[PDB]
Amino acid sequence: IVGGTASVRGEWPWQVTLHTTSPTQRHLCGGSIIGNQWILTAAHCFYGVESPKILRVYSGILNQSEIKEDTSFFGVQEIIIHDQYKMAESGYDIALLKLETTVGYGDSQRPICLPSKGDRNVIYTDCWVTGWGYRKLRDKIQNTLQKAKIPLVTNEECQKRYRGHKITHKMICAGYREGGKDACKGDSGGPLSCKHNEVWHLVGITSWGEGCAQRERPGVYTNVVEYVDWILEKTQAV
Ligand SMILES: O=C(N[C@@H](Cc1ccccc1)C(=O)NCCc1cc(Cl)ccc1-n1cnnn1)c1ccc2[nH]c(=O)cc(O)c2c1
């Protein structure tokens, strides 16, 4: 996160750190708890990931230094990638991780609500992007979970900023016209969480952008409201 501040423990209890054990143990992507055995994340995170066996999900983490070999985690049973996904820049940048065991909800880990399909006509004014990603394009993975308040940008305005790309209504952008606050490397897959009527909603999934926090280059997120049916299809299968 560029231009963010340290989060407080328990602030974003739906936020997870997805780690990989191949070739070495490292943070791979962010993710969000959406159900007791479900993590919502980005499809681009699994480029070259051949098996769910190399993945570990850690919930209730403020600091990456909390993670050692004796730290509890959730194994991944299945990786479900949207079948229309080709690349982040083209959309459908969404995936579900079915966990091998259920998450016990508490004050350190709980699910974030998905946006209500009836509320596609609501204006979100209190949106935050969170993650352990870089503070600048040439940086490193942060120990403490960072947060940044970012204003949502219209599809029309975001399309003006990305000449040569096709910003679809399945994408949602956020950023200041002058830049300064954004997601960066390591933040992808994480949430863009918006508080409306005292309830937090998973409005976006960190996906792509031209550099980090550049002037007139908003961050591009998967517009979660447009995938509610797909999430229900996959999580509520008979
Ligand atoms: O590049 C990374 N992540 C990419 C995506 C990815 C995922 C998995 C493997 C490879 C690449 C990312 O977050 N990409 C974020 C995309 C992005 C989103 C938005 Cl909304 C705005 C601006 C941007 N950026 C544009 N350029 N940088 N960020 C990434 C992930 C985990 C890492 N762990 C480490 O220990 C060391 C790393 O250097 C490291 C880097």
Side-chain angles (χ1 to χ4, degrees), residues 1-49 51-68 70-116 118-119 122-137 139-177 179-238:
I1 303 291
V2 185
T5 54
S7 289
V8 182
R9 189 178 296 279
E11 217 181 335
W12 313 101
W14 49 86
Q15 177 85 59
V16 304
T17 169
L18 173 62
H19 282 220
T20 197
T21 64
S22 191
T24 47
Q25 242 232 73
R26 72 179 215 154
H27 164 82
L28 180 69
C29 273
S32 302
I33 300 172
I34 62 159
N36 60 21
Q37 59 179 14
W38 299 103
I39 307 299
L40 196 62
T41 190
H44 70 258
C45 292
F46 308 96
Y47 180 79
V49 164
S51 160
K53 294 181 186 189
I54 64 155
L55 298 185
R56 297 178 165 207
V57 173
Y58 295 94
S59 52
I61 302 289
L62 171 59
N63 292 311
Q64 288 290 329
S65 60
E66 291 181 53
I67 308 170
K68 290 175 86 270
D70 67 357
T71 301
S72 71
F73 61 92
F74 296 93
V76 177
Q77 194 170 95
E78 205 197 348
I79 302 159
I80 308 164
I81 286 152
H82 196 291
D83 65 30
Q84 284 178 267
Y85 171 79
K86 167 48 136 190
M87 54 203 290
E89 288 165 292
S90 287
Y92 305 101
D93 194 9
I94 191 170
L96 282 156
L97 302 182
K98 192 184 180 189
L99 306 177
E100 277 173 348
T101 48
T102 65
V103 181
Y105 299 163
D107 292 300
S108 79
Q109 53 196 38
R110 60 93 147 170
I112 184 169
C113 291
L114 293 178
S116 314
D119 293 12
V122 303
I123 319 135
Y124 294 103
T125 63
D126 186 13
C127 301
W128 298 72
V129 66
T130 52
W132 291 269
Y134 287 23
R135 291 163 310 192
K136 50 180 222 299
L137 201 43
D139 195 50
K140 55 166 77 65
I141 294 307
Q142 298 301 295
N143 185 37
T144 313
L145 183 57
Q146 307 284 117
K147 55 176 185 196
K149 190 172 186 181
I150 329 272
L152 288 188
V153 154
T154 63
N155 173 262
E156 188 201 34
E157 174 75 341
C158 188
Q159 182 61 85
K160 286 184 214 300
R161 308 299 172 228
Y162 284 105
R163 194 174 178 241
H165 279 94
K166 176 58 193 170
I167 311 300
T168 67
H169 279 108
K170 282 192 155 79
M171 295 171 183
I172 197 170
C173 319
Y176 295 90
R177 200 191 190 267
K181 295 197 183 172
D182 199 11
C184 198
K185 293 185 171 203
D187 291 319
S188 77
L192 170 72
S193 313
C194 306
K195 192 205 247 184
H196 161 246
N197 296 336
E198 285 303 287
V199 187
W200 288 95
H201 295 98
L202 190 45
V203 162
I205 308 167
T206 304
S207 189
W208 67 278
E210 184 52 56
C212 306
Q214 300 199 95
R215 161 178 187 179
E216 284 157 69
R217 295 295 198 164
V220 195
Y221 300 79
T222 303
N223 185 16
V224 171
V225 77
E226 297 293 301
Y227 293 94
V228 175
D229 296 330
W230 179 87
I231 298 163
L232 290 183
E233 179 196 347
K234 304 300 183 178
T235 68
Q236 316 301 314
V238 298

